[PDB]
């Protein structure tokens, strides 16, 4: 494990909100950080 798994738009989304995928344990099938994961990251503190 070295590169995080997430959708390109999710990465941009996070970068836009100040969030980094590297700190988001996405649950997309294999652990892909989806818009839901990010939205949960900010609204899940």
UniProtKB/Swiss-Prot annotation:
The organism's place on the tree of life at top rank: Bacteria
Coiled coil: none
Domain named Peripheral subunit-binding (PSBD): residues: 5-42
Function: The pyruvate dehydrogenase complex catalyzes the overall conversion of pyruvate to acetyl-CoA and CO(2). It contains multiple copies of three enzymatic components: pyruvate dehydrogenase (E1), dihydrolipoamide acetyltransferase (E2) and lipoamide dehydrogenase (E3).
Protein family: Belongs to the 2-oxoacid dehydrogenase family.
Record note on quaternary structure: Forms a 60-polypeptide structural core with icosahedral symmetry.
Protein name in UniProt: Dihydrolipoyllysine-residue acetyltransferase component of pyruvate dehydrogenase complex
Organism per entry: Geobacillus stearothermophilus
Gene: pdhC
Portion of the full-length sequence here: 126 to 170 of 428
């Amino acid at each position: 494990n070295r590169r995080v798994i997430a959708m390109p738009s999710v990465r941009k989304w996070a970068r836009e909100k100040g969030v980094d995928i590297r700190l988001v344990q996405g649950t997309g099938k294999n652990g892909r950080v989806l818009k839901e994961d990010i939205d949960a990251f900010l609204a899940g503190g």
